[PDB]
Amino acid sequence: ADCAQKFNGLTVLPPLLTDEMIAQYTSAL
Amino acid sequence: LVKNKCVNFNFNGLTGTGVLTESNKKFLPFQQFGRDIADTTDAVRDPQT
Ligand SMILES: *[C@H]1O[C@H](CO)[C@@H](O[C@@H]2O[C@H](CO)[C@@H](O)[C@H](O)[C@H]2NC(C)=O)[C@H](O)[C@H]1NC(C)=O
């Protein structure tokens, strides 16, 4: 469900491992 | 009126701090403020223009 973006000082920080990177690990295993 | 710079604004007795830009959305004639799902004003209609 759907600039820091969020008026009340709410921010979402991106994960260290991107979605593409996680798939690569899955492919490797 | 100012666009594309962060500014303190009051529109018809509504006060917010934000960056103002033109939008595609078309308001209903009678309504003036716009509000999102989380009840934060997302759009405003200037009375003058
Ligand atoms: C209120 O006055 C403003 C400013 O004179 C009007 O705005 C103008 O409207 C004319 C005709 O629509 C436009 O051609 C102009 O470009 C507009 N700006 C100016 C500065 O003249 C407005 O129409 C008037 N009436 C309202 C909002 O009811």
Q: What is the DSSP string of A1-29?
A: ------TTS---PPPSS-HHHHHHHHHH-
Please indicate the experimental technique that yielded this structure: cryo-EM
Q: How far is the C-alpha of B3 from the C-alpha of B7, rounded, in Å?
A: 9
Task: Kindly report the nearest CA distance between residue B42 and chain A, in angstroms.
Answer: 9
CA A12 from centre of chain: 8
Q: How far is the C-alpha of A6 from the C-alpha of A11, rounded, in Å?
A: 7
Give the residue among B34, A8, B35, B11 at the shortest CA–CA distance from B2: B11
- The 3-class SS string of B12-33 reads CCEEEEEECCCCCCCCCCCCCE
Q: How far is the C-alpha of A18 from the C-alpha of A14, rounded, in Å?
A: 8
Q: Which residue of B has its CA nearest to A1?
A: B37
Task: Kindly report the nearest CA distance between residue A22 and chain B, in angstroms.
Answer: 32
- Classify residue A14 by its DSSP letter: P
Contact B34, B41 (CB under 8 A): yes
